Every structure is written in C-alpha cells, then in structure tokens.
Amino acid sequence: CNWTGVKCNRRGEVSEIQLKEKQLQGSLLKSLTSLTLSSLQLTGVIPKEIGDFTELELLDLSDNSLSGDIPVEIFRLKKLKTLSLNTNNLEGHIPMEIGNLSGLVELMLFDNKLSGEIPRSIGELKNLQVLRAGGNKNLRGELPWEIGNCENLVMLGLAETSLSGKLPASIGNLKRVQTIAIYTSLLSGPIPDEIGYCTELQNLYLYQNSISGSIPTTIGGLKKLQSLLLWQNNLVGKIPTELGNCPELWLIDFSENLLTGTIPRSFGKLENLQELQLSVNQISGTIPEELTNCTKLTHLEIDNNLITGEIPSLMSNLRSLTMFFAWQNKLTGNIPQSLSQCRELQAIDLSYNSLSGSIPKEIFGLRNLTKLLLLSNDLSGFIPPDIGNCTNLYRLRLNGNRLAGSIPSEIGNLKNLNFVDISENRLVGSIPPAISGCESLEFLDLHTNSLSGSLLGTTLPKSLKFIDFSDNALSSTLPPGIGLLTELTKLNLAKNRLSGEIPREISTCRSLQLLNLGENDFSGEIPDELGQIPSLAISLNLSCNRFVGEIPSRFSDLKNLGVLDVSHNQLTGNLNVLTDLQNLVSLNISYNDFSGDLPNTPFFRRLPLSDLASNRGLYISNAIS
Amino acid sequence: DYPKPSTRPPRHN
Ligand SMILES: *[C@@H]1O[C@H](CO)[C@@H](O[C@@H]2O[C@H](CO)[C@@H](O)[C@H](O)[C@H]2NC(C)=O)[C@H](O)[C@H]1NC(C)=O
Ligand SMILES: *[C@@H]1O[C@H](CO)[C@@H](O)[C@H](O)[C@H]1NC(C)=O
Ligand SMILES: *[C@@H]1O[C@H](CO)[C@@H](O)[C@H](O)[C@H]1NC(C)=O
C-alpha cells in the first residue's frame, strides 16, 4: 500500500486517497481520512455510500461531470472540515442537515446546476470560513438571516445566482469577513447600514443587481476597504464623503446608477486610488482640484453625467493616468495644455461637451495615445501640425466642432491611423496629398466642411474601406484613380461641385456596397460599367445631377441593389431594365424624362403618383389576359 | 465558469 497517491496513517491503514487529471469516466478501509477524486471526468450520481467512510475530514470531488442530488448522508460526516463539490453538474436543494457539520471550514459548491434556497442551517456552522456557492443560476431566495451566525466567515460569494431580496442586517455580525461577492444576481433593496460593522471587509461586489436606496455612509468606517464595485444598480443619492477615510481603497465603480451630488473633495485623501468609475449617473459639480492628488490613478471615467466647469489644470499631477473619459457632461473652457504631461495617456474622450478654444498642440506629443475623441464641442482654431508627432494615434474623431483652416500634411506621418472623422467643421483648402502616406487608414469622413479643389486617386491610401466627402465645395472630375481603391465599400461624394462623366474604372472597385454621387454637376450618360459591381447592395444615389441618356442595360445585373435613386436628372427611355430586380426595395425615378409602361406588380403601384407625374410618359399598365 | 469580478466595461465614442 505504498502506491503513489496513497498516504498511510501512522497506525498503518489507508489514510488519504489522491487523484488528479487522470482522464477517467463513468460513475465512481473505514479509516480513510481524506478523499480527493478531482479532474477525473466522472459522471452520474455521488454514491450514497460516501457516508461509509466515517473518518473523512476532507472530501474533494471538484471538477468532474458528476450529477444528480447531493446524497444527504454526505452530511452525516461530522469530522469533515472541507467539502468541494464545485465545477460539477450536481442539482437539488442544499440540504438543511448541512447545519449538522460542526467542523466544516471550507465549503465549495460553485459552478453547478444546483437550485432551491439556502438552508437557514448555515448559521449552525460556527467554524465556516469560505462559503462559495455562486455560478448556480437557480439558487434563489433571500440570503438567510442566520448567515450572521457564521462568526469566522472570511469569504462569501453567491455571484451569478438568482439570490434575491435584501442583504440582511445580520451582516453586521461577521467581523472577520474579507470578501463579499454577490454580483449579477437578483438582489434588491438598500445595502444595509450594518455592513459598516464588518471591520475586516476588503472587497464588496454587488454589481449588476437592482439595489435601491443610497450608498450607506458607514462604509467609510471600513478601514481595510479596497475594492467597491456597485455598478448597474438603482443606487440613488450622494456619494459619501467618508469614502475618503479608506486609505487602502484603490478601486471604486459606481458606474450606471442614479447618483446625485458632487464628486467628494475627500477623494484627494485617497493615496492608492488607481481607478475611479462614475459613468452614467446624475452627478453634478465641477471636477474637484483635490482629485489631482490621486497620484496612482490610471482610469478616471466620469463620463455621462452633469459635471460642469473647466478641466482642472493640475491634471498634470497624475502621471500614471491612462484612460480619461469625460464625455456627455457640460464642461467649459479650454482643454488645458497641461493634460499632455500625463505621458501614459492611451485614451481621451472629451466628446459631447461645451469645451472651447483650440486643441492644445502638446496633446499630439503623446507617444502612447491611440484614441483622441473630441467630437461634438465648441472647438475652434487650426488642427495643429504637431498632429504627425502622435505616433500611435489609431482612432481620431474631431467631428462636430468649428475647427478652421486646411488639414496639415503631417497627418500622413501617422502610420497606425485607422479611423479619422473631421466631419462637420469649418475646414478649407484641398485634401493634402500627403494623406496618401497613411498606410493603415480604412475610414475617412470629411463631410460637411468647406473643403475645395480637385480630388485625386493618387491622394488616397489604397486601404480605405469608407470615404465620405459629402457636403463640401469639391470640384472638377472624379478621378480614374478611384479604380485603385479596391477595398472601398461606402463612397459618398454627395453635395459637391463635381462634374464630367463618371469614369468607367469605377467598375474595378470590386468591394463597393454604397455609392452616393447625389447633388453634383455630373453629366454624360451613366456608363455601362456602373452595373458591374455585383457588390452594390446597400445604395446607389445618382440623383440631382445632369445625367442624360437611358438607364444602362447592365443595371439589371445589380441584383443585390436595395435602394436606387436617379431623381432629378435628364434621363429618358423606359424602366423595363429595372423590372427584374427582385431585391429592389426603394426606387426614386421622379423628375426625369422617362416614358412607357410599368407592370402592375405591388412594387410599382407603391411608387407615388406625383413621382410618375414629374416624368414625360410614365403610367402603370395592365397585362393582356 | 461564472466570470471573475469585473468593472463596468468602458465606453467611448
Ligand atoms: C512635434 O515635433 C517637432 C519636431 O521635432 C517639435 O519641434 C520643434 O520644436 C523644438 C522644441 O520645441 C524647437 O526647438 C524647434 O525649433 C522646432 N522645429 C521645427 C522645425 O518646428 C515639436 O515641439 C513637436 N510638437 C509637439 C506638440 O510635441
Ligand atoms: C440622394 O441624394 C440627394 C441629394 O444629396 C438626397 O437629398 C436624397 O435623399 C438621396 N436619396 C436617398 C435614397 O436618400
Ligand atoms: C427619392 O426617394 C427616396 C425614397 O423615397 C427619398 O428618401 C429621397 O429623398 C428621394 N430623392 C430626392 C433627391 O429627393
């Protein structure tokens, strides 16, 4: 009996059995004191004969497929200090007789199929330390009051269960409890004030419930408190200033609640705060200067609130800041230059605010910044030339501001830049040919600007998926170079001064799902090649130009087209070439010179009558029976 | 498993 995995007692009989990761299967010495069969891929029920070893202090069945209920006689072993049934399929209620185990220290039921309530008998276990039952979706009911009687409790977690109701005031009694995890559950009601009575509490995870009332002030008296995750609940009221009295607290998440009030000035006292998340609340006030005393702060997410004022200039005092999101507030003044002294900033989102003045150039001196999102503010000035200094810029959105002048040619310095949106501004001049040097640029939106001059195919990086130049002053002709953007998908040139023929090389853009040429000076006949992208699916808008001739025959090949608008042109002839397009959803042929009959299909009887009326000869016909 | 504790996932425009 010297076999590996077996331990004999000093009186010679078998004491311990140990097996792990042996890839077994199926179902599964009255002195044996510890039994571990774990990672064995066993199935079926726990044999009710498990009670036949009356000497067991430890039963570890964890990480198998084992099924059925938990044999109640497993609770007839009163020397058991450890029970791990976790990571199995066991179903059933938790037996009341569990209270009969005086010596149970660690109890692990988690990641099972279990259901029912938690027996009120857990309070009979006076030496219980870790209770982890979470990851049972049907384990439910209120948390029993008697839970306050487990005096030595250290870890409680019920996370990802159906557990509901209010945490009982009983929790005042666990004076050694370090971690309470009940998260993504059915909990409701207010956090009980009496939780301020757990002195040893370190981490509180109540996130993703519906928890009402307000955050109890008494949480400030928790001297050892470290992590607070309250996010996605109903929490109302002001953030308690007493949280500043919790020295070890490096993490606070109140995101997505109803809170009101000011971000507390006492937060300055918090020397260890790495992450502060308040997003989606009703919080008001200015950002307090004392929060800049927060040296270890990496993430500050204050977005989606009522915060007012100017961004504090002392923000330079936080040298470890990575992510700063203030979007959807009411913030005034300049983006302070001194924000560029946070050398570790990866991401800034100041979008949806009132910020004014120019964008300080020093921000583009940030070497690790992949995201600058300033969209929707009152921003004015030029885009600094220093924009090429920003090596890692990936996502850039300046849209919805007043920024003036030309787009600096340095932006072609940026080799990682995937996404730029400068739409809805005052920008002028030509689009700088230097942008052709953005190797990575897939999405470019310049729409609603004052841009002018002549487009060029040599001006565009070949990797572009998406281009919107609409609503500008752009003139002359669409270049044949357009045939070189083979990955292009949406292309919108609408509302410009563009003219001439449509170049036939558009047919060599093989990826195109959307083409909007609407409202320009284009003329000539719509080329035969336009029907040659089988890819055109989403939309084709040729409206409001000078096009003449007949709708081209190859058009019947656009079998995936769902929207076509040819309105306000000089086009003539019939629509017969359009009568086989079954996926055609929206068609605007109005204000043209078309004539001839349309079938009585439910499609064409949907076309407005004024639509047909703006043409030369259009009318619905009736087929000869 | 049931997932380890986490912060609300951050959102930007
Ligand atoms: C972007 O890069 C340029 C080029 O290295 C930086 O600047 C020059 O700046 C230095 C120091 O301020 C001056 O001594 C030179 O006269 C400048 N040279 C030229 C030709 O302008 C610039 O500071 C960087 N910008 C940012 C915001 O980091
Ligand atoms: C086509 O372009 C014109 C002019 O820009 C626009 O007003 C119209 O809405 C567009 N057609 C569709 C399908 O919306
Ligand atoms: C033509 O019809 C479409 C769909 O009804 C409409 O949205 C569009 O505005 C019309 N085109 C123009 C140029 O008005």
XYZ file of C-alpha atoms and ligand atoms in Angstrom:
694
model
C 0.000 0.000 0.000
C 2.915 2.327 -0.818
C 1.362 3.311 -4.168
C 1.748 6.892 -5.447
C -1.317 8.898 -4.439
C -1.868 6.980 -1.202
C -0.914 8.095 2.320
C -0.983 5.604 5.202
C -1.677 6.662 8.806
C 0.956 6.013 11.497
C -1.207 3.018 12.590
C -0.811 1.510 9.104
C -4.264 1.668 7.459
C -5.119 3.831 4.481
C -5.470 7.464 5.410
C -5.582 9.549 2.204
C -6.513 8.967 -1.453
C -5.414 11.485 -4.111
C -6.042 11.537 -7.881
C -5.901 14.474 -10.344
C -6.042 14.887 -14.159
C -6.185 11.157 -14.974
C -8.906 11.430 -17.672
C -11.249 8.695 -16.315
C -15.011 8.362 -16.902
C -18.315 6.939 -15.660
C -19.542 6.536 -12.094
C -17.143 6.205 -9.178
C -10.551 0.870 4.754
C -13.033 2.567 7.071
C -10.130 4.664 8.384
C -9.601 6.835 5.256
C -9.381 10.431 6.468
C -9.208 12.375 3.172
C -10.639 11.644 -0.250
C -9.736 13.502 -3.401
C -11.054 12.452 -6.754
C -10.771 15.562 -8.891
C -10.376 16.293 -12.626
C -11.428 12.692 -13.332
C -14.269 13.248 -15.857
C -16.553 11.062 -13.715
C -20.319 11.033 -14.279
C -23.549 10.021 -12.611
C -24.609 10.396 -9.008
C -22.416 10.702 -5.927
C -22.817 7.202 -4.465
C -24.877 7.351 -1.262
C -22.209 5.034 0.191
C -19.916 8.039 0.547
C -21.075 8.093 4.169
C -19.374 4.681 4.578
C -16.082 6.416 5.339
C -16.879 7.874 8.738
C -13.334 9.182 9.175
C -13.243 11.806 6.401
C -12.093 15.339 7.224
C -11.830 16.236 3.541
C -13.921 15.392 0.508
C -12.801 16.924 -2.773
C -14.942 15.852 -5.720
C -14.340 19.064 -7.680
C -14.127 19.426 -11.473
C -15.963 16.355 -12.800
C -19.236 15.813 -14.601
C -20.956 14.317 -11.532
C -24.764 14.650 -11.496
C -27.974 14.176 -9.511
C -28.670 15.415 -5.986
C -26.215 15.660 -3.090
C -26.744 12.485 -1.025
C -27.986 13.738 2.335
C -25.811 11.215 4.149
C -22.756 13.112 2.870
C -23.877 15.393 5.701
C -23.612 12.551 8.198
C -19.837 13.051 8.360
C -19.119 15.348 11.301
C -15.352 15.229 11.011
C -15.493 16.866 7.582
C -13.603 20.178 7.544
C -13.722 20.548 3.792
C -16.294 19.935 1.113
C -15.600 20.720 -2.527
C -18.441 19.679 -4.840
C -17.714 22.525 -7.269
C -17.406 22.558 -11.062
C -19.880 19.702 -11.439
C -23.482 19.226 -12.531
C -24.977 18.445 -9.131
C -28.577 19.578 -8.813
C -31.000 19.762 -5.917
C -31.582 21.892 -2.859
C -28.848 22.428 -0.310
C -29.890 20.025 2.467
C -30.792 21.522 5.841
C -28.772 18.765 7.519
C -25.652 20.597 6.350
C -26.001 22.547 9.606
C -25.125 19.305 11.402
C -21.478 19.507 10.331
C -19.887 21.292 13.265
C -16.426 21.159 11.779
C -16.910 22.355 8.207
C -14.293 25.023 7.416
C -14.288 25.496 3.651
C -17.452 24.793 1.596
C -17.267 24.998 -2.222
C -20.498 24.345 -4.173
C -19.887 26.751 -7.051
C -20.369 26.240 -10.815
C -23.087 23.595 -10.593
C -26.678 23.087 -11.673
C -27.952 23.479 -8.069
C -31.273 25.117 -7.157
C -33.529 25.805 -4.179
C -32.940 28.182 -1.294
C -30.008 28.434 1.082
C -30.968 26.486 4.205
C -31.315 28.557 7.376
C -28.931 26.000 8.953
C -25.671 27.547 7.665
C -25.762 29.501 10.936
C -25.096 26.288 12.850
C -21.660 26.142 11.221
C -19.582 28.187 13.606
C -16.178 27.471 12.106
C -17.169 28.061 8.458
C -14.755 30.382 6.690
C -15.260 30.145 2.961
C -18.697 29.640 1.502
C -18.721 29.848 -2.253
C -21.919 28.654 -3.982
C -22.149 31.027 -6.952
C -22.490 30.047 -10.594
C -25.739 28.248 -9.845
C -28.377 30.070 -11.857
C -31.362 28.695 -9.930
C -30.070 29.018 -6.376
C -32.537 31.547 -5.015
C -34.453 33.116 -2.165
C -33.393 35.697 0.368
C -29.973 35.287 1.986
C -30.894 33.669 5.325
C -30.701 35.812 8.450
C -28.816 33.072 10.259
C -25.816 33.707 7.987
C -24.765 36.305 10.568
C -24.060 33.416 12.911
C -21.077 32.162 10.938
C -18.650 34.049 13.050
C -15.420 33.051 11.325
C -16.604 33.868 7.823
C -13.972 35.311 5.526
C -15.314 34.721 2.003
C -18.977 34.820 0.989
C -19.922 34.601 -2.568
C -23.099 33.876 -4.333
C -22.195 35.625 -7.589
C -24.214 34.781 -10.695
C -27.148 33.241 -8.815
C -30.865 34.034 -8.609
C -30.466 35.023 -4.981
C -32.798 37.892 -4.210
C -34.208 40.228 -1.616
C -32.171 42.442 0.688
C -28.878 41.534 2.350
C -29.981 41.066 5.958
C -28.788 43.360 8.743
C -27.277 40.103 10.032
C -24.148 41.009 8.058
C -23.316 43.395 10.890
C -22.114 40.311 12.770
C -19.360 38.942 10.502
C -16.355 40.775 11.911
C -13.748 38.750 10.041
C -15.393 38.798 6.566
C -12.971 39.960 3.869
C -14.831 39.496 0.583
C -18.498 39.612 -0.158
C -19.198 38.687 -3.743
C -22.798 38.738 -4.819
C -22.775 40.027 -8.353
C -25.023 39.537 -11.345
C -27.862 38.363 -9.091
C -31.498 39.269 -8.221
C -30.653 41.345 -5.105
C -32.875 44.367 -4.355
C -33.422 46.873 -1.564
C -30.809 49.064 0.093
C -27.368 47.916 1.224
C -27.887 47.526 4.961
C -26.139 50.180 7.049
C -24.939 47.458 9.384
C -22.362 46.423 6.754
C -20.264 49.178 8.305
C -19.931 46.752 11.205
C -17.714 44.330 9.273
C -14.276 45.714 10.167
C -12.247 43.290 8.102
C -14.217 43.806 4.844
C -11.888 44.314 1.858
C -13.879 43.807 -1.368
C -17.587 44.445 -1.903
C -19.001 43.115 -5.187
C -22.736 43.820 -5.530
C -22.644 44.927 -9.180
C -25.449 44.064 -11.663
C -28.434 43.800 -9.376
C -31.219 46.254 -8.754
C -30.129 47.778 -5.486
C -32.070 50.731 -4.239
C -31.667 53.422 -1.647
C -28.265 55.087 -1.364
C -24.688 54.029 -0.538
C -24.520 53.889 3.263
C -22.207 56.461 4.878
C -20.978 53.765 7.282
C -18.896 52.197 4.507
C -16.429 54.995 5.308
C -15.623 53.385 8.634
C -14.256 50.353 6.879
C -10.579 50.965 7.404
C -9.363 47.962 5.390
C -11.661 48.586 2.364
C -10.031 48.185 -1.049
C -12.460 47.469 -3.884
C -16.014 48.758 -4.236
C -17.996 47.503 -7.278
C -21.596 48.779 -7.232
C -22.157 49.217 -10.949
C -25.532 48.730 -12.677
C -27.952 49.084 -9.819
C -30.610 51.615 -8.798
C -28.423 53.404 -6.259
C -29.694 56.880 -5.506
C -28.359 59.894 -3.527
C -24.959 61.447 -2.899
C -21.582 59.628 -2.849
C -20.471 59.543 0.817
C -17.516 61.809 1.573
C -16.407 59.343 4.230
C -15.039 57.099 1.476
C -12.005 59.406 1.667
C -11.198 57.744 5.019
C -10.449 54.388 3.362
C -6.654 54.522 2.732
C -6.241 51.163 1.015
C -9.056 51.716 -1.473
C -7.644 51.549 -4.977
C -10.845 50.733 -6.902
C -14.272 52.420 -6.993
C -17.018 51.588 -9.513
C -20.388 53.339 -9.175
C -20.994 53.324 -12.931
C -24.644 53.156 -14.173
C -26.745 54.214 -11.225
C -28.890 57.214 -10.298
C -26.435 59.057 -8.024
C -26.599 62.846 -7.487
C -24.275 65.262 -5.728
C -20.644 66.218 -6.097
C -17.536 64.090 -6.545
C -16.249 64.385 -2.940
C -13.181 66.527 -2.219
C -12.185 63.931 0.382
C -11.174 61.681 -2.546
C -7.911 63.630 -2.596
C -7.006 61.841 0.611
C -7.070 58.521 -1.247
C -3.433 57.769 -1.910
C -3.911 54.369 -3.521
C -6.810 55.021 -5.940
C -5.943 53.527 -9.358
C -9.392 53.501 -10.907
C -12.432 55.751 -10.426
C -15.528 54.884 -12.430
C -18.671 57.089 -12.116
C -20.018 56.767 -15.674
C -23.786 57.076 -16.275
C -25.122 58.844 -13.216
C -26.672 62.246 -12.459
C -23.559 63.600 -10.673
C -23.033 67.382 -10.784
C -20.458 69.956 -9.683
C -17.021 70.837 -11.026
C -14.233 68.223 -11.037
C -12.572 68.878 -7.645
C -8.924 70.018 -7.715
C -8.071 67.698 -4.851
C -8.694 64.636 -7.052
C -5.419 65.579 -8.755
C -3.662 64.492 -5.504
C -4.539 60.950 -6.581
C -1.078 60.034 -7.871
C -1.653 56.321 -8.557
C -4.802 56.942 -10.713
C -4.843 55.106 -14.050
C -8.515 55.143 -15.065
C -10.760 58.143 -14.433
C -14.184 57.544 -16.039
C -16.555 60.388 -15.187
C -18.491 60.370 -18.475
C -22.282 60.594 -18.903
C -23.125 62.940 -16.060
C -23.959 66.572 -15.264
C -20.406 67.689 -14.293
C -19.723 71.355 -15.059
C -16.724 73.643 -15.038
C -13.269 73.503 -16.578
C -10.975 70.502 -16.679
C -8.576 71.064 -13.750
C -5.138 72.166 -14.994
C -3.425 70.279 -12.165
C -4.481 67.124 -14.045
C -0.783 67.077 -14.940
C -0.208 65.841 -11.397
C -1.467 62.406 -12.357
C 1.427 60.828 -14.185
C 0.065 57.309 -14.269
C -3.275 58.211 -15.916
C -4.023 56.025 -18.943
C -7.722 56.399 -19.672
C -9.589 59.702 -19.165
C -13.308 59.800 -20.252
C -15.370 62.910 -19.502
C -17.861 62.664 -22.427
C -21.526 63.679 -22.059
C -21.179 66.319 -19.389
C -21.350 70.067 -19.505
C -17.678 71.136 -19.470
C -16.466 74.602 -20.392
C -13.151 76.345 -21.129
C -10.030 75.125 -22.925
C -8.773 71.601 -22.883
C -5.836 72.505 -20.600
C -2.405 72.171 -22.259
C -1.038 70.581 -19.084
C -3.051 67.443 -19.785
C -0.191 66.455 -22.122
C 2.057 65.980 -19.101
C 0.306 62.706 -18.428
C 2.736 60.763 -20.538
C 0.974 57.433 -20.124
C -2.387 58.505 -21.610
C -3.684 55.881 -24.032
C -7.195 57.274 -24.498
C -9.013 60.601 -24.153
C -12.725 61.113 -24.767
C -13.965 64.656 -24.153
C -16.894 64.327 -26.595
C -20.320 65.872 -26.119
C -19.362 68.876 -24.023
C -19.004 72.652 -24.280
C -15.161 72.887 -24.480
C -13.820 75.856 -26.438
C -10.668 77.391 -27.913
C -8.059 75.435 -29.814
C -6.885 71.913 -29.162
C -3.539 72.414 -27.448
C -0.697 71.081 -29.586
C 1.042 69.326 -26.707
C -1.633 66.593 -26.710
C -0.260 65.344 -30.030
C 3.066 64.961 -28.272
C 1.569 61.969 -26.529
C 3.505 58.924 -27.658
C 1.112 56.240 -26.385
C -2.247 57.821 -27.321
C -4.338 55.623 -29.631
C -7.674 57.410 -29.120
C -8.471 61.119 -29.167
C -12.233 61.739 -29.240
C -13.187 65.412 -29.069
C -16.390 65.141 -31.110
C -19.313 67.486 -30.535
C -17.958 70.527 -28.743
C -17.389 74.214 -29.447
C -13.742 73.691 -30.547
C -12.148 76.343 -32.819
C -8.705 77.008 -34.347
C -6.455 75.007 -36.689
C -5.635 71.359 -36.316
C -2.032 71.640 -35.134
C 0.732 70.427 -37.497
C 2.092 68.608 -34.465
C -0.571 66.003 -35.231
C 2.119 63.957 -37.033
C 4.115 63.733 -33.775
C 1.357 61.420 -32.444
C 2.774 58.056 -33.432
C 0.201 55.624 -32.135
C -2.977 57.558 -32.955
C -5.488 54.993 -34.161
C -8.964 56.451 -33.700
C -9.242 60.183 -34.241
C -12.621 61.994 -34.133
C -12.740 65.793 -34.206
C -16.173 65.984 -35.756
C -18.879 68.447 -34.763
C -16.761 71.458 -33.908
C -15.689 74.722 -35.544
C -12.002 73.888 -36.413
C -10.749 76.089 -39.253
C -8.096 76.120 -41.979
C -6.514 73.321 -44.038
C -5.738 69.753 -42.944
C -1.982 69.670 -42.177
C 0.076 67.416 -44.439
C 1.744 65.900 -41.399
C -1.237 63.643 -40.859
C 0.363 61.370 -43.435
C 3.095 60.819 -40.827
C 0.647 58.638 -38.933
C 1.171 55.028 -39.912
C -1.187 53.433 -37.415
C -4.130 55.724 -38.049
C -7.180 53.636 -38.827
C -10.098 55.989 -38.292
C -10.356 59.733 -38.739
C -13.560 61.775 -38.513
C -13.207 65.501 -39.106
C -16.739 65.933 -40.447
C -18.957 68.916 -39.556
C -16.367 71.681 -39.238
C -15.032 74.794 -40.987
C -12.019 73.149 -42.732
C -10.746 74.638 -46.006
C -8.380 74.096 -48.920
C -7.624 70.887 -50.780
C -7.277 67.466 -49.202
C -3.468 67.176 -48.710
C -1.841 64.527 -50.966
C 0.356 63.584 -48.017
C -2.548 61.617 -46.533
C -1.651 59.008 -49.170
C 1.035 58.015 -46.695
C -1.415 56.709 -44.126
C -0.786 53.021 -44.642
C -3.462 51.935 -42.186
C -6.322 54.320 -42.923
C -9.611 52.488 -43.518
C -12.294 55.048 -42.544
C -12.256 58.690 -43.608
C -15.156 61.054 -43.014
C -14.746 64.685 -44.089
C -18.423 65.501 -44.653
C -19.993 68.929 -44.060
C -16.938 71.114 -44.408
C -15.725 73.940 -46.612
C -13.204 71.734 -48.493
C -12.497 72.628 -52.134
C -10.216 71.920 -55.061
C -9.872 68.773 -57.139
C -9.969 65.198 -55.827
C -7.234 62.750 -56.936
C -6.840 58.978 -56.968
C -3.158 59.372 -56.026
C -4.141 61.293 -52.902
C -5.850 58.313 -51.274
C -4.355 55.391 -49.330
C -5.327 52.195 -51.125
C -6.562 50.525 -47.915
C -9.623 52.752 -47.488
C -12.868 50.929 -46.742
C -15.017 54.023 -46.154
C -14.982 57.553 -47.646
C -17.464 60.389 -47.058
C -16.592 63.746 -48.672
C -20.209 64.883 -48.922
C -21.311 68.451 -48.395
C -18.181 70.331 -49.463
C -17.064 72.596 -52.326
C -15.114 69.874 -54.199
C -14.938 70.388 -57.963
C -13.690 69.108 -61.310
C -13.941 65.423 -62.073
C -13.978 62.181 -60.206
C -10.554 60.721 -60.952
C -9.950 57.413 -62.742
C -7.635 56.734 -59.802
C -10.795 55.828 -57.926
C -10.404 52.448 -59.613
C -7.427 51.826 -57.352
C -9.285 51.663 -54.034
C -10.255 48.044 -54.237
C -11.219 47.628 -50.616
C -13.595 50.577 -50.726
C -17.096 49.799 -49.509
C -19.019 53.006 -48.943
C -18.214 56.067 -51.033
C -20.157 59.267 -50.574
C -19.356 62.335 -52.685
C -22.810 63.938 -52.416
C -23.499 67.684 -52.349
C -20.327 68.976 -54.061
C -19.382 70.816 -57.280
C -18.025 67.676 -59.081
C -18.612 67.385 -62.861
C -17.775 65.486 -66.047
C -18.557 61.857 -66.901
C -18.473 59.038 -64.418
C -15.140 57.302 -65.201
C -15.550 53.711 -66.362
C -12.824 52.490 -63.977
C -15.271 52.522 -61.055
C -16.122 49.002 -62.191
C -12.739 47.887 -60.934
C -13.641 48.791 -57.359
C -14.755 45.296 -56.527
C -15.818 45.808 -52.909
C -18.274 48.713 -53.303
C -21.572 48.426 -51.421
C -22.610 52.097 -51.482
C -22.097 54.860 -53.995
C -23.623 58.298 -53.411
C -22.931 60.797 -56.205
C -26.064 62.855 -55.484
C -26.272 66.635 -55.930
C -23.332 67.438 -58.196
C -22.623 68.661 -61.728
C -22.067 65.214 -63.317
C -23.120 64.853 -66.921
C -22.926 62.464 -69.847
C -24.532 59.045 -69.978
C -24.412 56.783 -66.952
C -21.722 54.340 -68.076
C -22.363 50.677 -68.807
C -19.735 49.788 -66.193
C -21.763 51.070 -63.251
C -23.774 47.884 -63.276
C -20.601 45.902 -62.943
C -20.051 45.816 -59.210
C -22.157 42.785 -58.248
C -21.270 44.050 -54.805
C -23.586 47.091 -54.926
C -26.138 46.184 -52.309
C -26.920 49.000 -49.945
C -27.458 52.100 -52.078
C -26.917 53.885 -55.407
C -27.818 57.583 -55.477
C -27.251 59.328 -58.810
C -29.869 61.948 -58.005
C -29.657 65.702 -58.637
C -27.148 65.728 -61.477
C -27.242 66.467 -65.205
C -27.130 62.813 -66.408
C -28.731 62.098 -69.778
C -29.473 59.030 -71.881
C -31.218 55.843 -70.834
C -30.723 53.767 -67.716
C -27.970 51.372 -68.868
C -28.778 47.728 -69.604
C -26.131 46.155 -67.332
C -28.149 47.738 -64.478
C -30.329 44.612 -64.474
C -27.187 42.932 -63.158
C -27.390 44.854 -59.942
C -29.292 42.019 -58.406
C -28.371 42.916 -54.851
C -29.293 46.617 -55.014
C -31.859 47.595 -52.387
C -32.041 51.346 -52.991
C -31.645 53.259 -56.235
C -32.322 56.976 -56.597
C -31.957 58.527 -60.049
C -34.247 61.501 -59.307
C -33.740 64.996 -60.696
C -31.841 64.154 -63.898
C -32.387 64.350 -67.681
C -32.716 60.569 -68.157
C -35.085 59.189 -70.837
C -36.412 55.871 -72.131
C -38.317 53.220 -70.195
C -37.718 51.398 -66.914
C -38.035 47.822 -68.265
C -34.401 47.156 -67.369
C -35.439 47.683 -63.706
C -38.366 45.248 -63.671
C -36.388 42.116 -62.844
C -34.663 43.457 -59.744
C -36.392 41.496 -57.022
C -34.396 42.837 -54.104
C -35.160 46.380 -55.118
C -36.697 47.996 -52.061
C -36.684 51.769 -52.676
C -36.715 53.407 -56.138
C -36.926 57.126 -56.846
C -37.272 57.797 -60.582
C -39.071 61.104 -60.110
C -38.290 64.306 -62.027
C -36.827 62.798 -65.190
C -37.831 62.366 -68.851
C -38.852 58.683 -68.653
C -41.827 57.279 -70.620
C -43.509 53.918 -71.227
C -45.464 51.461 -69.113
C -44.707 49.840 -65.767
C -46.181 46.475 -64.692
C -48.980 46.253 -62.102
C -46.666 44.493 -59.616
C -47.117 45.573 -55.963
C -43.800 47.336 -56.292
C -44.709 49.954 -58.889
C -48.187 50.648 -57.508
C -46.255 51.761 -54.428
C -44.297 54.415 -56.377
C -46.096 57.727 -55.703
C -48.304 59.099 -58.475
C -46.648 62.523 -58.331
C -43.427 60.577 -58.844
C -44.698 59.259 -62.176
C -46.212 62.695 -62.830
C -42.867 64.530 -62.857
C -41.717 62.485 -65.858
C -42.617 62.523 -69.579
C -44.656 59.349 -70.213
C -44.896 57.184 -67.093
C -48.008 55.126 -66.323
C -48.936 51.746 -64.807
C -50.275 49.207 -67.296
C -52.489 46.121 -67.224
C -51.279 42.896 -68.808
C -53.378 41.360 -71.565
C -55.216 38.373 -70.103
C -17.105 29.144 -15.081
C -19.029 32.063 -13.686
C -16.842 35.064 -14.626
C -14.301 36.654 -12.312
C -15.279 40.056 -10.787
C -15.104 42.999 -13.190
C -15.597 46.721 -13.629
C -18.293 48.034 -15.960
C -16.801 47.792 -19.459
C -15.679 51.244 -20.602
C -17.448 53.072 -23.419
C -16.191 55.789 -25.749
C -17.418 57.383 -28.974
C 6.491 67.925 -32.890
O 7.756 67.714 -33.487
C 8.532 68.873 -33.697
C 9.807 68.474 -34.433
O 10.656 67.726 -33.586
C 8.818 69.563 -32.366
O 9.561 70.740 -32.588
C 10.485 71.809 -32.947
O 10.348 72.032 -31.560
C 11.587 72.218 -30.918
C 11.339 72.204 -29.414
O 10.155 72.917 -29.118
C 12.207 73.531 -31.399
O 13.487 73.725 -30.818
C 12.315 73.576 -32.928
O 12.518 74.910 -33.350
C 11.077 73.031 -33.646
N 11.395 72.697 -35.028
C 10.551 72.987 -36.014
C 11.047 72.806 -37.420
O 9.401 73.383 -35.805
C 7.502 69.922 -31.693
O 7.704 70.536 -30.433
C 6.627 68.682 -31.561
N 5.328 69.113 -31.094
C 4.758 68.544 -30.046
C 3.457 69.119 -29.578
O 5.256 67.583 -29.478
C -29.831 61.153 -52.985
O -29.149 62.396 -52.961
C -29.909 63.560 -52.662
C -29.010 64.806 -52.678
O -27.964 64.687 -51.729
C -30.611 63.374 -51.316
O -31.263 64.556 -50.884
C -31.501 62.139 -51.377
O -32.002 61.868 -50.102
C -30.678 60.917 -51.743
N -31.509 59.736 -51.901
C -31.798 58.927 -50.879
C -32.019 57.471 -51.170
O -31.894 59.332 -49.724
C -36.285 59.762 -53.665
O -36.966 58.820 -52.855
C -36.310 58.423 -51.669
C -37.141 57.305 -51.063
O -38.482 57.754 -51.033
C -36.198 59.639 -50.758
O -35.722 59.322 -49.457
C -35.302 60.652 -51.453
O -35.257 61.823 -50.669
C -35.804 60.984 -52.865
N -34.772 61.680 -53.621
C -34.645 63.013 -53.633
C -33.451 63.584 -54.351
O -35.445 63.768 -53.084
